[PDB]
Each structure stands twice: as structure tokens, then as C-alpha cells.
Symmetry: C4
């Protein structure tokens, strides 16, 4: 049956799966004690200003008032009272017991200022709880690489192969693969390149490195005359000091951000003479992906143990002589 329904839907089911720009991530909760501190500080500073005004205006001795004396802010009889009035103005609770009167222009202007400072102070709380909220970093790896690489024979050509799989049902827009052999080398003119990176060809010049990754796929690398692996047999493999790196970039629909899945294979991790265990089976009227066979291989004794470079050289005599 269908692999892709007439509307894009993919017919597969997965199974058996296991300045202050640094403020955005200013911390985990050191930001919450930072804000709760921003409050306390402005609440105290203003509680102090109002207490100073109540001190000098002579209110502390006639907090309620007379027909002759009107306080700046009613009921500010001390600092705990001044502190509370301050809090009540900013939080905008304003219980009302402590209340500004129209007596001191200073107190009025102080209430006007604490209202703006207060509105600004928490318009930022929503801006920080916005950065540190709408922008994490531990995006769970949705892409998966086989544990080992395999060199076997496909369609008469000797290739290095490795698997890639989408752990999610979500797609990867404009996805492509890359590989490269990393080993230290000395140039002709005698020069030391510590860790030289050499491209491993997986299809770039024909666009074949562009993949449509629904169910897991096996990535191929034909080992030919132009390969940094051309002259490597199975024995050479259990001795060499090289490492192959594998990348899979693309646009991940889920995290909706351009991704770069990576992984590696040391010569000691690539299994020669093997093949991957299928993972896609058709359960009739729908396909399934037994994600348990993902890293599973299996011997193929009919696989040449010599290098691709020699495999070809020999072919000539048995065609020539």
C-alpha cells in the first residue's frame, strides 16, 4: 500500500523506542530571587521616603488628623506602617487604611513616581520570564545515528554505510547528509595539520545527499578511486588511527530551528563485512518501524576482505589476462 497518503500524511508507525543579553538565561531561579529582591528593594526605599515625609511633616504624632491638621498619607504612624503603605501602592492593592491625602505635593508626586517605577518593574518581569521561557537549550535530540558504520557490498560497489533515523513522527525539511574522515597528516612540503578534515563523498554533486527521512535510511559511501578509504582492507581497519564524522543538517519541524545532528565512528567502530538488519516491515495496510533493529547488523562472509583499491586492480587481470 501507500507510503505517503495523497495529502502528505506519512503511512508509518514507530515502535519499541526506549551586555545583559545573557540575562535571557540569567539562571534557573536565581532570577526569581532577583525579582523578588527587586520588589523588596523598591518597596523599602519608598517606604523610607514616605516615612521621612511623615517624620518631617509631623504626622507620626497625629496619624489620623484633626480639623486643623491633615497628614500627607493617613495612618503612617511608623516605619512598618510606612513600609506597608509603600507596598500597597506598588502592588496596587491599596487596602485603603493607609491613604494619600491631598496635602503634601511631595507625597502626591512620590505616589505618582512609585506607580510608574512599579509598572515598569513588572513589565520587565514578564519580559524576563519571557526570554528564559521562550528560548531553552536542551532540545531533545530527535535525530538518531546507528551505533556503528558498516562496509559491505551493494550493487557491485564497495561502500561504507551508516544509519540515520527520525525519532519523531515530525518531518525534517530540506535535510542533507555529510561525512568526513578526520586524521592528522603531514603535507608534501612537510607541514603539520593536527586534525585534518577530509570530505567523504555521499552524493553532493548529484544532490543525492538530500534526503527525505521518514523511516530510517542507510547512508551510502561508495569507496572509489577518489575516496580517502580507497586503499583500506579489513586488516588495515584493525590498525588505523582515523575517525569518520557524520553530520545530518536540516530544518526540524518540531524545534522549528535549523539542526545539525552529529556522531562518530573510529576505525575500531566500523564493522567490516556486515549489513544492517531491516527495520521497516509492512503489517499490511500500514508500515511499521521496529526501532529495536536500528543498530543491529549481521555478517556477510561473501564480502571481500581486501581494499577497494585492490579489488579493482585485480578485476583487470581477470578481464585482461
Amino acid at each position: 500500500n501507500r507510503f505517503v497518503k495523497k495529502n502528505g500524511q506519512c503511512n508509518v508507525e514507530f515502535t519499541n523506542m526506549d551586555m545583559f543579553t545573557t540575562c535571557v538565561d540569567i539562571r534557573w531561579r536565581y532570577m526569581l530571587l532577583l525579582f523578588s529582591l527587586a520588589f523588596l528593594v523598591s518597596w523599602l526605599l519608598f517606604g523610607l521616603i514616605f516615612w521621612l515625609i511623615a517624620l518631617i511633616h509631623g504626622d507620626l504624632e497625629n496619624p489620623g488628623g484633626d480639623d486643623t491638621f491633615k497628614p500627607c498619607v493617613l495612618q503612617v504612624n511608623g516605619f512598618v506602617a510606612a513600609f506597608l503603605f509603600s507596598i500597597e501602592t506598588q502592588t496596587t492593592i491599596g487596602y485603603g487604611f493607609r491613604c494619600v491625602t491631598e496635602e503634601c505635593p511631595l507625597a502626591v508626586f512620590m505616589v505618582v513616581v512609585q506607580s510608574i517605577v512599579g509598572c515598569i518593574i513588572d513589565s520587565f518581569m514578564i519580559g524576563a520570564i519571557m526570554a528564559k521561557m521562550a528560548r531553552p537549550k536542551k532540545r531533545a535530540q530527535t535525530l538518531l545515528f546507528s551505533h556503528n558504520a558498516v562496509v559491505a557490498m551493494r550493487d557491485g560497489k564497495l561502500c561504507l554505510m551508516w544509519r540515520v533515523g527520525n525519532l519523531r513522527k515530525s518531518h525534517i525539511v530540506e535535510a542533507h547528509v555529510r561525512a568526513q574522515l578526520i586524521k592528522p597528516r603531514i603535507t608534501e612540503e612537510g607541514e603539520y595539520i593536527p586534525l585534518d578534515q577530509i570530505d567523504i563523498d555521499v552524493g553532493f554533486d548529484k544532490g543525492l545527499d538530500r534526503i527525505f527521512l521518514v523511516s530510517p535510511i542507510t547512508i551510502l559511501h561508495e569507496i572509489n578511486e577518489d575516496s580517502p578509504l580507497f586503499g583500506i582492507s579489513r586488516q588495515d581497519l584493525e590498525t588505523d588511527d582515523f575517525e569518520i564524522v557524520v553530520i545530518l543538517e536540516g530544518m526540524v519541524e518540531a524545534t522549528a530551528m535549523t539542526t545539525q545532528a552529529r556522531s562518530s565512528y573510529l576505525a575500531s567502530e566500523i564493522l567490516w563485512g556486515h549489513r544492517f538488519e531491516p527495520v521497516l516491515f509492512e503489517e499490511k495496510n500500514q508500515y511499521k518501524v521496529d526501532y529495536s533493529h536500528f543498530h543491529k547488523t549481521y555478517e556477510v562472509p561473501s564480502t571481500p576482505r581486501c581494499s577497494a583499491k585492490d579489488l579493482v586492480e585485480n578485476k583487470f587481470l581477470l578481464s585482461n589476462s
Copy 2:
């Protein structure tokens, strides 16, 4: 007249169209009962703390006060009264009947704490109603694929064709197409590739797969020596077990996100010997797109019923012998 005005505007009119990172989409409205619950819980817990303080401080028996006794919070005569005071502090309504006094440092600090917890609690409500708001998933498909593929003859070459159309007036930035024949196959060395994906060439090596999709366009695939369709005649078509997948990626101006429109054609869905009904007509001084002829085809009996592989082989004798 003009197809593209001197300022980009396109001269066409369309007609007849039919951790908690999972919190972002934590639900539909199970989040609203989640918040309305976050409230109720903090309102009750604090109402309890204040009621405990009013219990131990001996206020429940003298809620208003004397010249000798001052409660921690005036008018907390019970738990419903304690509950209300709690609510009033956080919501910041503070009617004022229930009011903190400057007596118990504990009660003062409790009001200071409930104000911060409260401000934090709803700074997050705006952060969640922000994720689940500024990031959906049912983005309406703006791209459209013809219902069937067609194999006919254009400019002396035999090609597989299919249509694509932009359902919106909005453009698709950097848009390109891809196709690929999906069928199971056994390799030379005898190996089972369940669902092998084989690229169908639509112009990648010349950049011709890059499209400027205003009015619908017909995508062509010349069936040549290098095609996975090279040896398929019309009869073979009513028997084969293959499926062709079609992708159209690009940057959609509307959803302003990289898209991947898909679709499929089973051998049984591609109409041999046909051609698409035009959809673009010039109503003089402006072009129109009768989107009703989108999936409409029409027979072309002068179309070869043999495969492209044979069509070419024959050409030699009638040129040779």
C-alpha cells in the same frame, strides 16, 4: 500585459477555490483549569496561614480591635474571612475591609511573600498563554498538488508531469521541487531494501528545480536512459507496484516558516497519454487562474503507448535501416 508589475506586485487573480517543553502545547483548555487551579491553591494555602495567625494571636474573638488589642489583619473572624483576605491580597483588589495592621511581623512578611508569589504566578500565566498562543500546528496547507500525474509528450521528449499551485496570493521564497520512485528492491548481492527511495530527476543539476510559483505550474520529468521509469510502457503501468512521491519545499511568506508540501502517485494514479487543462487565461489587462481546471486532464491519442526505452531504440532503425 504584465505578469509582474515593476514593483513586485503579481498581476494574477485566483478564482473558484473550494522537560516541560511540552507545556507550550500542554493542552487545549486543560491549561486554563490548570491556572484557575494554581490560583485557588495559593489563595487557600495563604488563607490558611492567615487564619492560623489570627487563631494563635487571639484575633478571632476581637476582629476589630480595642485601644488595648490590635489584630494582625483586621476583620479576620473565621476561615471564609481569612480566605477572602488572602484572595484580596493576591488579586490585589484589597477591598479594604480585611486589612493588615502593623502588629505581627509575621503577618506583614506573609503579605510580602504572597505578593511576590502572586506576581510570579501570573507573569507565567502570560508566558503560557504565550507559548500555546504564538505557536500552533494545524497551519492550513497553502500548497496544492494535482490529483494525478500524467505521462505525455512535450517537445519531442517523453515526460512524467504533475501540477503544483499556491493556494494563496502570498509567495514562496526559495522554492524547489523533488520527486522519487518508491519501491522495494533486492540488490545484486541479494539484499532486501524494504522501501527503496530512488530520485526522480526534475532539474537539480541546472537549478531548474528552483521554481517561481505564482500561477500553478506543471512540473516535468523527462523519462530518459537515466530514469527509473525509462523502461515502462502504458501496459506495464497497469501492473507495476511502484509509487512516486512528490515534495515542494520552500519558505512560505504566510506561515513564515520553512515548508515541505508532499503528495503521492501510485502507478494506478498516473494517467498515461494525457495533458493538463490550462488554468491561466488572460482576461485582458490582468490574468486569471480558474482553479477549477487544476486537476483536469484530457486524452492525447497521438501519444506513444510504448516505453521511453523502446521509443528510442526504434528511432535508430528509422534513421539507420
Copy 3:
């Protein structure tokens, strides 16, 4: 001197320049009357509920209370009073004159519900004033195309040319150009392609279509054997029914979004035998771009009036015979 300082800075100065997913752009201000209406409605509905409770509980006749009778909400003596209490609870002003008492569990729960509905109602106001704010559509065109195309002779090759310029000092990341001749044509097998789009080659196979657009640049299109313009002389130009479209895609640093600048040239708009007036002059120790010469051309009478197809055919005899 330097065109690009050692740190990226570019040494040029410009002168003489002239479901409800549709809710995001739900309107201009029909959204503000939408919210101010959302308020009024919930304020009235609740004012009604509280007035109903005050009606049935018998408060309307004893709004203040006795030592024997306690209202649900003090001072609700009518509907205007009930309306106000409702408003005061949601806005969270709570002047205090109208105040909930701990008498009716219904009234308490009604205040609890109006507080949550109210907090939700305006957490959305910030979410809508967020969509319709952080996502417009009239992004001012920052890219500019010359008014006319020009066909002249450069380095011995006959080319079609047109200008492109960045109206801003900001750069265009990964910018590339494209052109294509749009004209209706009938295929060999006699088929009508209304508006056929034919790629005009500007350097894709060598990557030369990739541009680093600081000061304006002249885009070239060598008219060769492979051009849809190969057989067009100056006379043919004052008769043909073709139109050339020009695109310039890339990532615009300013609008930080993938862009697609467009434009067009009808045969009647491309000036044969011309050349663009320079726009870049070095005012010593800094470069300037007189953006007034942008669309200015100038005759070059030594320019062949015949087509590129003929220009080449002739070259043979005067090299041959």
C-alpha cells in the same frame, strides 16, 4: 582605500535617496473595540449575577446591614451599584465601599470566579496585542531594481544587464539572483503553455549568482547559444511580446526574514545599446554611492544592432573566408 574594514564594517556612505489564526491580524482597531467589549460584557454579566443575589438575599432593602442582617456584598443597593461592584472586582480596583462579606458562599465563589475569568481575559489581551504587534506585513522594500534593463557589450560578450541595490546599510545574508523570460508558447506536439517561464542564466552553475551586495551591482546575462535571447536584434526588440522577470532572494538582516525582491522588464523597457551611469565614487578615505544615478543610462553607438546569434555567425567568415 578599504572597501571592508578588518572587522566587517563596510566603508560606504549612501546619498541622495528619495481557525482564529487570522486573529493575529484580526484587524486594525476592531480588536480594541473587541476587547473593550469583552470587558463590558463580563462586567455586566457579573454585575447581573451579584444583583440577582442581592435581590434574592434581600439586601436591596438593607444594603449596609444590622446586628441581625449581613448582606452578601455590602452596599449593593441597585444595579448601578451591582454593576460597579462587578467592575471593581475584575479591574481589581476594589475601592472598598462595595465589599463582599463572608455571608453567602455563592457570592464568595462568584468573586473567586470573576477573578479568574478576569485574569484570563486580559492575559489574552496581552497575547493579541502581541500577535498584531510582533508580526506586521508592510515591511518597507529594502531592495531596489533599476528601472530598465540594458543590452550592451562587456568583455567581448553581448549581455542583458540590470541593476540591484540595497537601500539600507544593513546586509543581505546568502543573497542570490535569478531571471527568467516569460512568454506564451506552443509546444512541438502542439500544446498551449499560457505563460511559459524560461530561465535566464545569470551564473548558477558556477555559483556566480551568489552576490555580496554592498554598493549597487550590475547583474549580467551573457546572451549565448543557450539563451532564450540568442536570436534577438535591436529591431526585433521593438516588436516582441516577451517579458523578463527578475528576482533577488536572500536573508535580510533588518526584517530578519527570508526575502524575495521582484521586478520586471517588458521588451519595450530594456534599452539596447546602453550602459549604466556609475554610482560608486571614491571621495578619498571612504566610498560614496550617489543613488541618483541608479537608473541612469547612456548610449554606446559602437554597440552591435544585430542579434547575438548573428553576431557570432558572421565572426566565422571573417576568420574563415
Copy 4:
């Protein structure tokens, strides 16, 4: 050991490192005095409306009320009192001393209007402190270019080289390089191209310009027959008027935005006959990058002082004659 752990983690340690759309960036803090002004203005205008109502309704002479006279808003005895009531309604503090009564439908409707205007006014404060917060411009350069370019001999080919390094541990998704020689030139038909940009080949046609930039990398440019540097010897270098520009675009994981790192090299800045000092050393069981040797070169006297064009011409005689 490993350069890339089996899960993507990279085994390297760095050391020794030194309309109103313009409102988004409407300013630094001229926006805060803009808002604090938006407040003051609406607070004053409404304080005026309420004072006008209290004037005409005759309240200023009976602010508290009688059993015969009920004010529109209790306690508005002047403009400072009217001003305060206004502030208290919008901020939603509502101390309660100044309170609306159900007498004047006008005053009620005025409180209803100031509540909506007020809620709108600061829903925007969160929208502006959102633009100017979640979108800066001084993104710290994370990419680094060597101070000088070097022309030396690698693997028998004469190349122009320069270094690039990631100043962060974070990766660069889909990263590629570009270079181009910028010099003024006069065309064959005699035409003045002020500052002509000529591509310097760094591997585009094989995809070798695509880099996986972990530890710093040396970018190569083989100077061959096709190079705009083919005919330049060391002497010519201390005379020429050319400048080479270098770009490194890619997707930077940190700023999560498409980047374009730039830099330049005047003929006088490219050191002939040199080589870069290594920067990658293996401290056993982990690699290190001594970022202090980044711009450090060193003479290689065995380096040809003649141009690549001549170096090749000579090779013929000593192979020929």
C-alpha cells in the same frame, strides 16, 4: 582519541581568549520617559474630566454628602483630589477614600472608559518592552578571521590561505565560505567598473566550501590558471592595488539567526612565503585550542617568490627540454 563523541559532543577545549516599526528600537530609555509620560497625560486628562463633573454637579462644596445630596465621586474636593482619584482608578490601586457613587451615569461611564484605556495603555507597555527587549543588534561577533592571509605551498599547489575560528563552543549550522578580489577595472570595450568584485575560488563546485568549524580551520585557495591571482609574484604583491574580501555565512546556534562574518586583506596584508602556527594540540584524552597562536605565522624560505603563472610555465621546460 575522539574529536566527536558518539553523541555529537565535541571533544575540544578553548583557551587563552582575550510606520512605527522603528518603535521596536524607538530608543534606549526615551521610551521609558515616553510611557511614564503616557501615564501622566491620561491621569491628568481624566483627573480633569472628573474635576469638571465634580465642579458642575456641585460636589466641591459637599464632598462627603448628606441624606439629601450624593456626589458623583466621594471626596473630590479639588483638582489634586480629582487628580488622585483619576490615578487610583487606572493604576487600580483604589485606596477607597475617593470613591465613585452610583449617582452620575456620566461619572460611572467615565470610570468604565478609564479602565479600558488604562488596561490598553499598559498592555502596550508590555508589547514595547517586548520588542526593544527580544530583538537587539549588537550581537557579539562569535566568528573570527586571522589578521593576515598567507600564500604558501601545500601539496604541490600554490595557495592563498586565511584562518577562521568559532569563538564559541556552540556550532555553526550549514556553514560555508566565500572570498573575492575587489579592484577597479576597465572593460575591453572601455568601461569603468569602479569597484569590481571577482570571485576567489574556495571549493564551491565540489561543495568543499561547506565547513564543519569546530577548532579553527585554514581556508585554502589554489592559485591556478583560473585565479584572479594567477599572475602575481611576491614582488608584484608589494605594489598592487587589490583587496581580498572574505565571508563566512552560516546558521549560528547561539544568536539563532543566519550570520555573515566578514573581513579583508589588502595586498599589503597578505604575507607571502608564510604558514600559520598550529593551534590544535592533543593534551591526551581531550584536544585543546591555544587561541593565542591564531594569528601567528612563520617564514618558509623554500617558498617560490615567483607567480603561480610562471611557476607552471617553467615546469614545462624541466619536463620538456
